[PDB]
Write a protein that binds this ligand. Sequence first.
Ligand code: FES
Ligand SMILES: [K+]
Ligand SMILES: [Mg+2]
Ligand SMILES: [Mg+2]
Ligand SMILES: [Mg+2]
Ligand SMILES: [Mg+2]
Ligand SMILES: [Mg+2]
Ligand SMILES: [Mg+2]
Ligand SMILES: [Mg+2]
Ligand SMILES: [Mg+2]
Ligand SMILES: [Mg+2]
Ligand SMILES: [Mg+2]
Ligand SMILES: [Mg+2]
Ligand SMILES: [Mg+2]
Ligand SMILES: [Mg+2]
Ligand SMILES: [Mg+2]
Ligand SMILES: [Mg+2]
Ligand SMILES: [Mg+2]
Ligand SMILES: [Mg+2]
Lengths: 122, 48, 137, 97, 128, 74, 86, 23, 72
Amino acid sequence: PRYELALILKAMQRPETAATLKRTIEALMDRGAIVRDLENLGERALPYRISAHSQQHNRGGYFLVDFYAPTAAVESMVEHLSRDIDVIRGNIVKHPLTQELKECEGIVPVPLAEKLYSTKKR
Amino acid sequence: REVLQLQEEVKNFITRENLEARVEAALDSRKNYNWAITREGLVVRPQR
Amino acid sequence: TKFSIYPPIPGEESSLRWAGKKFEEIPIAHIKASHNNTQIQVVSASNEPLAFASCGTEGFRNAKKGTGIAAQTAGIAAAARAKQKGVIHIRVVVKGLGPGRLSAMHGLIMGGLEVISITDNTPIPHXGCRPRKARKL
Amino acid sequence: SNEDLPISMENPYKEPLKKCILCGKHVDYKNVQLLSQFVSPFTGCIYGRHITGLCGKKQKEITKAIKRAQIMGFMPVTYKDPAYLKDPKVCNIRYRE
Amino acid sequence: DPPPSTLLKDYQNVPGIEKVDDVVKRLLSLEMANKKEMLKIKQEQFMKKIVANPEDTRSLEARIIALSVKIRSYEEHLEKHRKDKAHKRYLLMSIDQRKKMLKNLRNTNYDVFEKICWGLGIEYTFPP
Amino acid sequence: RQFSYLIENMARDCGEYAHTRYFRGGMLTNARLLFGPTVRLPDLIIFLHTLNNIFEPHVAVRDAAKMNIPTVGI
Amino acid sequence: AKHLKFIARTVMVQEGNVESAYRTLNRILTMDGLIEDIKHRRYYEKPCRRRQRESYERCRRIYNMEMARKINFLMRKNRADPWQGC
Amino acid sequence: KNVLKIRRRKMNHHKYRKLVKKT
Amino acid sequence: YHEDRIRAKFYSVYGSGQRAFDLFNPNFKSTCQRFVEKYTELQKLGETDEEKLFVETGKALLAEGVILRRVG
RNA sequence: AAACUCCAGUUGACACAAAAUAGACUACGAAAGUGGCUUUAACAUAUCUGAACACACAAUAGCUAAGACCCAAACUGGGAUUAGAUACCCCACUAUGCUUAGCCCUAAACCUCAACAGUUAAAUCAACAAAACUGCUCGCCAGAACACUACGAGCCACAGCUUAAAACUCAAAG
Ligand code: FES
Ligand SMILES: [K+]
Ligand SMILES: [Mg+2]
Ligand SMILES: [Mg+2]
Ligand SMILES: [Mg+2]
Ligand SMILES: [Mg+2]
Ligand SMILES: [Mg+2]
Ligand SMILES: [Mg+2]
Ligand SMILES: [Mg+2]
Ligand SMILES: [Mg+2]
Ligand SMILES: [Mg+2]
Ligand SMILES: [Mg+2]
Ligand SMILES: [Mg+2]
Ligand SMILES: [Mg+2]
Ligand SMILES: [Mg+2]
Ligand SMILES: [Mg+2]
Ligand SMILES: [Mg+2]
Ligand SMILES: [Mg+2]
Ligand SMILES: [Mg+2]
């Protein structure tokens, strides 16, 4: 199916960041993937201190990778990311654009519950 | 119709030949998914 | 400009300076308000111990330590040992819902120290370790 | 017979059903600027549908997105990002007074 | 087992899909789909092979074929998840509900009862 | 209470009676004790408001049917 | 621990008014639920007891929210008697 | 509803479990 | 009634005008009611669509001197 | 009081454990049960009822074997209280709670309200509770106690579970 790889790389120079992206995208194609796009969200400060591969990170580059791949290729790709030191954190999720949103009409009011107790004189 | 639309997009997919070029271009652009909303249900995208 | 209750962020420069110092350089007063005691420790921005005081170190014993008198007495003793080192403005960090949670803050004001901010660092786990069983008393 | 009799008709004056601010919009876990509009500036706690004003179907989407962005490295847990403190307030809660 | 290169049940019929790019044919195949799309094809084969009118799906014959494809799905899921007691109950009930279908079919149309038992490899066993 | 004055005047003008005040228990069923043994009860009762001030039927509606007095009501 | 310090549950003092700040801080924790959560986490509240309390707190909210809706609906009839004497 | 009918069964079971431990 | 659909739209497009109702007067005609009479009278002519028939009705009143301020 | 005082506080590093807020939502599952994140697989039946001759499941506790261990904690020890305290209160620590592979098969397993279909009118209706009824089917109960017992039989169960009586006694029990 269609997946999305939320990748958080390490704060590195451009020469090293390009080698990691290519190194990471070649691993997807080796597992039967069909890459579709490579979006960059920019380098920002992490919401919290992340510790990975005996390194304390405070900044990182956010990159997205939309691609198509079989179901059996996800688990094999999650292991590859773990070994890569440059990758601080990487997770795969089903692409949000392959989930049609049912049209909504509006809020339906709920009337108070009635006939919960017998109409007797207590 | 979906197949036809797909047959057009496949041209833009990354390939081993154009992999290096796409990486460099991505490092030059930026995608912004951040946008707020008001009480009137109106989107307010940041001016950046 | 206006006044905001949100503290200045280190990343963003601010115009609020206390005696020519930034919000980050201000020393910190860590208060641990327990149910039977109240410990106070003042430190600098570089985590350097300046003063330490507690209800026990001031002469109170057993149940008399879990009161607002012993907490205030400990705040005055910690504000007198830090004022000798050039401490005027501090950032309070309380941890716990004990009796001397507010009374200890008063003793710091009665020793010549000014409180610019108040931070709550009470430890709440998001689940964590299973506490002890309920009492029948 | 008579023509002044009423007719079997649906209410014309009935008003359209109300909608939440997010009705018809897509909630994504990368839009931290929108997700921070529904958390406490001080504790990072998620607000309820009686404060956010959202419907049940959309309040569940904001929650699942916040919990996903918090553990992925997009959003902080204990506090609200100071950068999004000056955003339009859509929640019905007043702390100071 | 349908090969992975097989196209989806929906896209095989559309015209013009015979001459398209190889990448577009690999995205519309069973390789880039989940387990439930391969079962929609397994059912299609049995209907043409066995049932006289594949189009009719509410007939007793088709229900047996639709249910026998689910039974095989549960056995492949239980071969890897032995401690999944939930799907082990759906299997034992599905085997009992198919037997109740084969009973009513053997009582109404014995000519087709033999065809289904042969096509699907089923052996009706009289209960003790 | 809004129309208590209007009704009391009408009864006086038409030479009839009115009871717009709090209805004490036994005005009809126990009348002989309250007033006297030779008292004469009404032959017709007219209810301009069948409810009391708590939105419940007036006790006279039930007490009149006990004493076999016909009632007219709005 | 891994988050930035002095950004959460932090309040600034206005004109050395510590009391007004502490009341504000203690009101933010109360509205968010931390205060009560910290008090129940002192001793372990077993599931059965925690399910009895949530059901008790939810039935009290309903009753307390419907009575107040009736008080504000009848507060209009708290005026003086317009038919004084009848 | 009282638990007087449960209290009779409570002692019966307790004395029986205590008698088996003895024999 | 059939004219309730007409009234619902008038109130949405224009809303109650400055003129205040006089419920005491039995033979009182409101600005909206006047709009209904014209709207229906023009329907007798043969127009079978609401949009055009609705638009033409407002123009007639403006010619008669009525004030029709739309919500916009 | 005892205990601790290679203790406490600030900061940094740091889990085979447990899963704030959302949840004022009321969803999933046959029930038990299920509320941190992601992915894979996946939630029987085109009439209903239907197995205490079978089959598959079944909280917690517990047994067997090998591991993990922050915290909690039966047992035990110590301190205190007490006429005594084998308890209520305080401290410490163990089985155990977790993982893996098997067994055990119980509960106030109770929403003490069976499944399918249907009704709101008439006598609505002992009382209380969560209003009163029709059709069909299965299961179950026939005074209290003896008895969640004895004998027999079956079971990886051996101080066990399931099924389950009688004699004597009472004129009440409920
Ligand atoms: S009302 Fe349509 S999505 Fe909330
Ligand atoms: K119960
Ligand atoms: Mg009672
Ligand atoms: Mg006994
Ligand atoms: Mg059945
Ligand atoms: Mg049964
Ligand atoms: Mg069990
Ligand atoms: Mg165990
Ligand atoms: Mg311990
Ligand atoms: Mg002892
Ligand atoms: Mg242990
Ligand atoms: Mg245990
Ligand atoms: Mg239960
Ligand atoms: Mg029962
Ligand atoms: Mg049944
Ligand atoms: Mg008996
Ligand atoms: Mg038992
Ligand atoms: Mg037995
Ligand atoms: Mg025996």
